Design an enzyme around this catalytic site. Sequence first.
Site, short mmCIF file in Angstrom:
data_model
loop_
_atom_site.label_atom_id
_atom_site.label_comp_id
_atom_site.label_asym_id
_atom_site.label_seq_id
_atom_site.Cartn_x
_atom_site.Cartn_y
_atom_site.Cartn_z
N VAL A 151 5.53 -0.15 2.78
CA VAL A 151 4.43 -0.25 3.72
C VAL A 151 3.51 -1.29 3.03
CG1 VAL A 151 2.47 1.03 4.71
CG2 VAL A 151 4.63 2.22 4.32
N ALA A 183 12.14 4.95 0.09
CA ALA A 183 13.58 4.83 -0.15
C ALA A 183 14.30 3.59 0.42
CB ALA A 183 14.27 6.07 0.35
N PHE A 184 13.75 2.89 1.45
CA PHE A 184 14.45 1.74 2.07
C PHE A 184 13.59 0.50 2.28
CE2 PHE A 184 17.46 5.13 3.21
CZ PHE A 184 18.62 4.57 2.74
N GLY A 185 12.36 0.54 1.77
CA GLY A 185 11.43 -0.58 1.80
C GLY A 185 10.04 -0.23 1.34
N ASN A 226 2.72 12.44 4.71
CA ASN A 226 2.75 12.18 6.17
C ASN A 226 1.38 12.31 6.84
OD1 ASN A 226 5.91 12.36 6.95
ND2 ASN A 226 5.46 13.90 5.44
N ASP A 251 10.34 18.25 8.00
CA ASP A 251 9.83 18.04 6.64
C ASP A 251 8.43 17.44 6.66
OD1 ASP A 251 10.02 18.07 3.77
OD2 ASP A 251 11.07 16.14 3.69
N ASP A 306 5.07 9.61 8.85
CA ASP A 306 6.45 9.23 8.51
C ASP A 306 7.44 10.07 9.34
OD1 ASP A 306 8.94 8.46 7.10
OD2 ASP A 306 8.29 9.43 5.22
N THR A 314 13.74 16.14 -1.20
CA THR A 314 12.80 17.02 -1.92
C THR A 314 12.59 18.29 -1.07
OG1 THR A 314 11.91 15.12 -3.04
CG2 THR A 314 10.54 17.08 -3.07
N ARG A 320 5.34 2.71 -0.71
CA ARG A 320 6.75 2.44 -1.00
C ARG A 320 7.58 3.64 -0.54
NH1 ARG A 320 6.57 -2.39 -4.56
NH2 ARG A 320 5.61 -1.01 -6.12
N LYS A 354 5.04 17.02 5.21
CA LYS A 354 4.44 17.08 3.88
C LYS A 354 3.18 16.20 3.76
CE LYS A 354 8.00 14.03 1.83
NZ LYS A 354 9.32 13.95 1.15
N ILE A 377 0.81 -1.22 0.00
CA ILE A 377 0.00 0.00 0.00
C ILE A 377 0.84 1.27 0.00
CG2 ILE A 377 -1.97 -1.25 1.01
CD1 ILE A 377 -1.12 0.83 3.55
N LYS A 430 5.34 -1.54 8.10
CA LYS A 430 6.49 -0.93 7.37
C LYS A 430 7.75 -1.78 7.42
CE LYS A 430 9.37 3.26 7.56
NZ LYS A 430 9.26 4.73 7.50
O1 LIG Z 1 6.93 6.04 6.61
C1 LIG Z 1 6.18 5.83 5.66
N1 LIG Z 1 6.63 5.95 4.33
C2 LIG Z 1 7.99 6.25 3.98
C3 LIG Z 1 8.75 4.96 3.74
C4 LIG Z 1 8.12 3.68 3.61
C5 LIG Z 1 8.87 2.48 3.53
C6 LIG Z 1 10.28 2.55 3.55
C7 LIG Z 1 10.91 3.81 3.63
C8 LIG Z 1 10.16 5.01 3.72
O2 LIG Z 1 10.76 6.24 3.81
C9 LIG Z 1 12.18 6.27 3.85
C10 LIG Z 1 12.78 4.95 4.40
O3 LIG Z 1 12.29 3.84 3.66
C11 LIG Z 1 4.73 5.42 5.86
C12 LIG Z 1 3.69 5.78 4.98
C13 LIG Z 1 2.39 5.32 5.21
C14 LIG Z 1 2.10 4.53 6.36
C15 LIG Z 1 0.70 4.17 6.71
C16 LIG Z 1 0.33 4.01 8.07
C17 LIG Z 1 -0.96 3.55 8.38
N2 LIG Z 1 -1.87 3.20 7.46
C18 LIG Z 1 -1.50 3.34 6.16
C19 LIG Z 1 -0.25 3.83 5.73
C20 LIG Z 1 3.17 4.13 7.18
C21 LIG Z 1 4.46 4.58 6.95
#
Ligand SMILES: O=C(NCc1cccc2c1OCCO2)c1ccc(-c2ccncc2)cc1
Lengths: 383, 380
Positions: B84, B80-82, B191, B186, B204, B225, B78, B188, B76, B99
């Site tokens: 969700v 830089a390091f994995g 988040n 940051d 995030d 960014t 994506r 945005k 659901i 995550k």
């Molecule tokens: O941190 C997030 N994304 C960034 C991210 C995701 C994976 C690897 C990353 C990365 O960023 C840099 C390091 O590698 C994030 C976004 C959405 C949710 C979420 C929570 C609850 N319900 C639905 C969705 C949870 C986490």
Amino acid sequence: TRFEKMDNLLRDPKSEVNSDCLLDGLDALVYDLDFPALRKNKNIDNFLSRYKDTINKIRDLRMKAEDYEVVKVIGRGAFGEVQLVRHKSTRKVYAMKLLSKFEMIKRSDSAFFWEERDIMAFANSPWVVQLFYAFQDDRYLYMVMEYMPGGDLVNLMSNYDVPEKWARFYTAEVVLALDAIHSMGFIHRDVKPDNMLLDKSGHLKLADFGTCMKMNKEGMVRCDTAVGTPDYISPEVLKSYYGRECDWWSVGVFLYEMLVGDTPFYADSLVGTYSKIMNHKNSLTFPDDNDISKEAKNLICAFLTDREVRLGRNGVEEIKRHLFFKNDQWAWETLRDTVAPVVPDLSSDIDTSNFDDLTFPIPKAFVGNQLPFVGFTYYSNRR
Amino acid sequence: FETRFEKMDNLLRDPKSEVNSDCLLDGLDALVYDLDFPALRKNKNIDNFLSRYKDTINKIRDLRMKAEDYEVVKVIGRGAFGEVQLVRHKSTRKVYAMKLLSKFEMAFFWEERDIMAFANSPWVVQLFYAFQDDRYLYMVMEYMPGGDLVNLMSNYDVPEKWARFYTAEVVLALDAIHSMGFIHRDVKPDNMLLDKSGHLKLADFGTCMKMNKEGMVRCDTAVGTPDYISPEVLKSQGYYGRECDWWSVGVFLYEMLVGDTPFYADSLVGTYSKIMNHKNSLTFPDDNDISKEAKNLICAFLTDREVRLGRNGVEEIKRHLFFKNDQWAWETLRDTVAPVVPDLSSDIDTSNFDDLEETFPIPKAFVGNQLPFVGFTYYS
Ligand SMILES: O=C(NCc1cccc2c1OCCO2)c1ccc(-c2ccncc2)cc1
Ligand SMILES: O=C(NCc1cccc2c1OCCO2)c1ccc(-c2ccncc2)cc1
């Protein structure tokens, strides 16, 4: 949701990976990394800096040597010493055995300290000296036991001429203490007055378990090397598949020394003793002035014989039933309740009147010198 | 002594403590990974320790949380390091957003775990579990089915009354993050996640950093960014505080009502330049439908940190004319009905999320690869 099994494995004092073992693992890791040469690794440096503060919190919160006031050194051994200590906070008195990790790594041919800690921590016998805490550091292993103010049997045998009635008591208590250890599944392998200690009320308890071996399915021990003391070692343990009867030979030697005043297989050369022991049949003799009873020489000789013949081959009752043990003071069952031949008189809780007044190289690459001690501490998870 | 015994014991169960049994078990299963190689088993210590604890630690592995305790429904998100991924606990039959961070591909994750696990705010996405295996770090969160604010801005020409609600929620969610002792840096739309009631929750926290004694942060690491980043963080190679998170907010209010960011430029370097030249580059369109109140609230946040609304506290923000309304009152905001409320099919509904779709090298010497992840595990 069976996370319950996890906590059991983490709280059982006999579990291989309880909180003590976990805390030891981290402690060992931080010890085996904090070297400028290794700290040239980014992975190693970071972890160390991140865990720096908490490892110091933990080291000072957990038990350490500086928690104990050392009163006097009341014993010495191959890899360390036994010191009479006082716990600064709790004010309580204990004998603390120290073992050098470096020394044991360099010279010991076994991990003897494991079964020794376990015999003393779980025996729950009035015949075995008990352990309260086990701990360690960068340099030593530590074993906190109950203090035996009456001293050992080597001291008693020197200070006094031991009469047959006194000898009958001490032999009898060693027989029960050894039966207790056999019942627990071990062979002592090194029975001698050095390992026979006396409590405030003068009753025997055993104390060095460095030679104890767990018995196999048939109550036997397969051995390459010989273990014990040159004087008290049985012919089987010397020649090197033996049983519990080896510990009974040492009792014979122990009785003989108390009555005669010298070991049965003495020689001027330490090697000459070996020759003598092997020739037990033509070296075991009693002195011209035979004041020792017929019944006493009988017991001695029924033990100072070959493995197959030896008294106690068919159980301990054979030993208890010996006429020599028949007396007007005690009965086997009531023995540790009766009054002792030598009831000491102690000045204070720290009275040492019955005791004679007395590291690893910095590495280049990762070596892991604290890894074979992980699991020793018996502090957080005890029974 | 009795206190020193009890301290140590309470410590072994304190989830906020660096020596909780889960962290202690971490270091131990880490020591096994980092040493179980033919080259290192040539050392008797290493060899024997391993022989001794191999089978019992793999018993520990089997009982503790592992990835295969979850059915992976859909990726659901994506990063830089994995990624969700929407997941369901095989037993519980409960649904979570979990995550993943690749150990091999990779410190930023420490403050993200603590914020999520210990924030205890209706404004922060909850962390239920944090676990690990040889390759990845897992973070199990409450699933936000309404999706982010990027998705919302795509499917609507955000009306002001809606903008105000979402702004007041970022204000409150940031102040909660601020009160925890962190600066976002940051903030945005990516988040800004929406729950089953269409109410906000920040998610995030990799960009977050702990404030110092005077409530400030200094950082040397690259920005990324720059679009929503303040000129102060952009100037830093240098300390800044609170006020930077308020700049980001002002960018987000401008986006919602104008369709583009205020310093958007075709290039990264070009955007950065527009941010530095912010008091000349910030322009409002020719025939905008922006309020007098909304236009002032933007400029107030889109100024140098020295003259910014929020420098003297969040109440300076909250009292702004823009927020004057009959539909809600700050203290009961999360209690009112949200402008967009998700219409969900099931527990595993991902209608509001876009559809979506390398090893450590066998070493010679002790490398200690697992060591930076010791203490990641957290349960509840
Ligand atoms: O941190 C997030 N994304 C960034 C991210 C995701 C994976 C690897 C990353 C990365 O960023 C840099 C390091 O590698 C994030 C976004 C959405 C949710 C979420 C929570 C609850 N319900 C639905 C969705 C949870 C986490
Ligand atoms: O086993 C002991 N000493 C042997 C010994 C001491 C140190 C290092 C050794 C070693 O043997 C193997 C090599 O390394 C021992 C002696 C005395 C007591 C004691 C008990 C209660 N009260 C007072 C004293 C406890 C233990």
